[PDB]
Write a protein that binds this ligand. Structure first.
Ligand code: WEM
Length: 126
């Protein structure tokens, strides 16, 4: 009934590294998706209490959102770029799982995903 705590975003027990792919994911991918007209429902964890969706966290057990991804990138939480790409994919699929196909929120997620895929097809080498 209450919201769960947000996903973990910082872990000092994991080694950290800076790569051109991780820099691209924050400076280009996250920054461009954040400013998209349909980004607003995906910038923070789904607040099931404020939105009156009592079954959201009964259905969605692996929540993910762009605010959490931004924090993970800033905190060097990811070692590999694919970990970050899987978080974006988890965010889109959570929307497709919870909501009815053809719903406006699903159309918004589909548009963000299309832009995300355009950015991932241009990921820099190594
Ligand atoms: C202040 O922003 C909002 O009011 C808000 C509305 C909103 C969602 C998220 C937010 C952000 S939050 C921090 O409150 O969780 C939202 C997000 N996601 C990912 C979902 O799967 C949803 N299913 C139904 C809603 C959402 C309600 N709804 C929504 N429903 C239909 C839409 F077309 C667009 C939407 F944003």
């Amino acid at each position: 009934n209450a919201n769960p705590p947000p996903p973990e975003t910082s872990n000092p027990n994991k080694p950290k590294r800076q790569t051109n792919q991780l820099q691209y994911l924050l400076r280009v991918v996250l920054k461009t998706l954040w400013k998209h007209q349909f980004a607003w429902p995906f910038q923070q964890p789904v607040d099931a209490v404020k939105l009156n969706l009592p079954d959201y966290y009964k259905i969605i057990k692996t929540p993910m959102d762009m605010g959490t991804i931004k924090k993970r990138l800033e905190n060097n939480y990811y070692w590999n770029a694919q970990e970050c790409i899987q978080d974006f994919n988890t965010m889109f699929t959570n929307c497709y799982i919870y909501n009815k196909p053809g719903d406006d929120i699903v159309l918004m997620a589909e548009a963000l995903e299309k832009l995300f895929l355009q950015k991932i097809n241009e990921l820099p080498t190594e």
